[PDB]
């Protein structure tokens, strides 16, 4: 496992040190349909002429990014994405910029968001939630081993691929960092207490997040919810959580170690790192290697009657794309 990780690190480091830039242009693609909206910008299904390949293109308006004070986070997102490599991470195929916009061309993942299936079906069975949760575990282990904090886990950001496996998308809040950082970002339902309390935090906020996610998948609703974020924060910070009476006792014990407001004893943050989680009883039947190799059979395989069909995604208002004749925000995004 070490030689895996150790070698993963050397590869990321070389890419991180000298990122790829300008690997395409908007002309080489045809616009088909808007697939969704993430942290910032829009993502559209596109077709790559020269190859006939379908991709998902994230487009960000440079001026809007500057307005929201997201420049550094945006540069983070591309620099990190061009550098990582993992089965459960959506792959970035190219990136480029024009006078107006930043572009990030990613693998098209046709099964849609976990979000859509979860809400439609209600909640997942424990073995079902375990299969998903394992892939996130391995993914955070990869990411944290490179000093990366994900900071935006939610079912909206988890796509289901043709083999029924998960791919994580939207690195808008991802950051390579040693030790602590302070930005107030993420999704209210998923925020760790240390974050809402401006205490300063580290990668343990991600393991809390996995807690929220396992709960939401198993229950059909988040541990902390309410009409407004403000009420949501009061409940995250209060040291209390209720479990549906169908939750197995092991699952409850896991969740108690994950939604641990005490950084001291929060699972994932102890002496044994991720192994504390990997070894919990709830994961007793989880075959960590077979899952990394996708040899494990998925619970659910999405309807897919086209290489470029979009019915597993909701429809969105289709917004035109405007490319200035004048360059915008040149110096800000020079490294993009």
């Amino acid at each position: 496992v070490k030689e895996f990780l150790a070698k993963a690190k050397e590869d990321f480091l070389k890419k991180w040190e000298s990122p790829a830039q300008n690997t395409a242009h908007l002309d080489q693609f045809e616009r088909i349909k808007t697939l969704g909206t993430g942290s910032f910008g829009r993502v559209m299904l596109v077709k790559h002429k020269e190859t006939g390949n379908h991709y998902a293109m994230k487009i960000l308006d440079k001026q809007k990014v500057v307005k929201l004070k997201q420049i550094e986070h945006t540069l983070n997102e591309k620099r990190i994405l061009q550098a990582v490599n993992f089965p459960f991470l959506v792959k970035l195929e190219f990136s480029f910029k024009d006078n107006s916009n930043l572009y990030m061309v990613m693998e098209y993942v046709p099964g849609g968001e976990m979000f859509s299936h979860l809400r439609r079906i209600g909640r997942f069975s424990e073995p079902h939630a375990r299969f998903y949760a394992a892939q996130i575990v391995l993914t955070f282990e990869y990411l944290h081993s490179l000093d990366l904090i994900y900071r935006d886990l939610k079912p909206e950001n988890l796509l289901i691929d043709q083999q029924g496996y998960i791919q994580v998308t939207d690195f808008g809040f991802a950051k390579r960092v040693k030790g602590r950082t302070w930005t107030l970002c993420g999704t209210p339902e998923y925020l760790a207490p240390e974050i809402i309390l401006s205490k300063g935090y580290n990668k343990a906020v991600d393991w809390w997040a996995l807690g929220v996610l396992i709960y939401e998948m198993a229950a059909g609703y988040p541990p902390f919810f309410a009409d407004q974020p403000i009420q949501i924060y009061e409940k995250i910070v209060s040291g209390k959580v209720r479990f549906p009476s169908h939750f197995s006792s092991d699952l409850k014990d896991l969740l108690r170690n994950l939604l641990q407001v005490d950084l001291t004893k929060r699972f994932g943050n102890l002496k044994n790192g991720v192994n504390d989680i990997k070894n919990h009883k709830w994961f007793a039947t989880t075959d960590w290697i077979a899952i990394y190799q996708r040899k494990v059979e998925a619970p659910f395989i999405p309807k897919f009657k086209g290489p470029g069909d979009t019915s597993n995604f909701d429809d969105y208002e289709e917004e035109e794309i405007r490319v200035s004749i004048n360059e915008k925000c040149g110096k800000e995004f020079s490294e993009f």
Partner: peptide, 18 residues
Amino acid sequence: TTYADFIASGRTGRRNAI
């Protein structure tokens, strides 16, 4: 039920980041 409260709440859609 907690599920009934969630389903009638304003946060069963796609949730934006802060």
